[PDB]
Amino acid sequence: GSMSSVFGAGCTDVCKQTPCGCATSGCNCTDDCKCQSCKYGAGCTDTCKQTPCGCGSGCNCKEDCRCQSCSTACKCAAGSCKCGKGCTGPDSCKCDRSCSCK
Ligand SMILES: [Cd+2]
Ligand SMILES: [Cd+2]
Ligand SMILES: [Cd+2]
Ligand SMILES: [Cd+2]
Ligand SMILES: [Cd+2]
Ligand SMILES: [Cd+2]
Ligand SMILES: [Cd+2]
Ligand SMILES: [Cd+2]
Ligand SMILES: [Cd+2]
């Protein structure tokens, strides 16, 4: 129940590479980047990618995490998701822990 995208809202051509070059040439993408490959390392942990997630109440991520399973519930509610997504809730949120809302 989500958009089938591997990109965010402003990815570089380096992200459009193959393999993804952001892990070689640096990352410069947006907070919506659904690319588990470039933003990894400085955002996640080996406990998050376990699928669904092994973090839960025992997280070991960085901060650039886009998962709402281990990240704490946003204060988004009643139109309080100013990033522009407008999820207004952690369950609807698909942003990261350092986004505009959070
Ligand atoms: Cd990207
Ligand atoms: Cd990428
Ligand atoms: Cd990137
Ligand atoms: Cd994570
Ligand atoms: Cd997680
Ligand atoms: Cd985590
Ligand atoms: Cd949020
Ligand atoms: Cd959101
Ligand atoms: Cd957001």
From TrEMBL:
UniProt entry keywords in alphabetical sequence: Cadmium, Metal-binding, Metal-thiolate cluster
Keyword Metal-binding attributed: yes
Highest taxon above the source species: Eukaryota
Gene Ontology molecular-function annotations: metal ion binding
Record-stated family: Belongs to the metallothionein superfamily. Type 2 family.
Protein name: Putative metallothionein
Species this protein is from: Littorina littorea
Taxonomic lineage from the root: Eukaryota, Metazoa, Spiralia, Lophotrochozoa, Mollusca
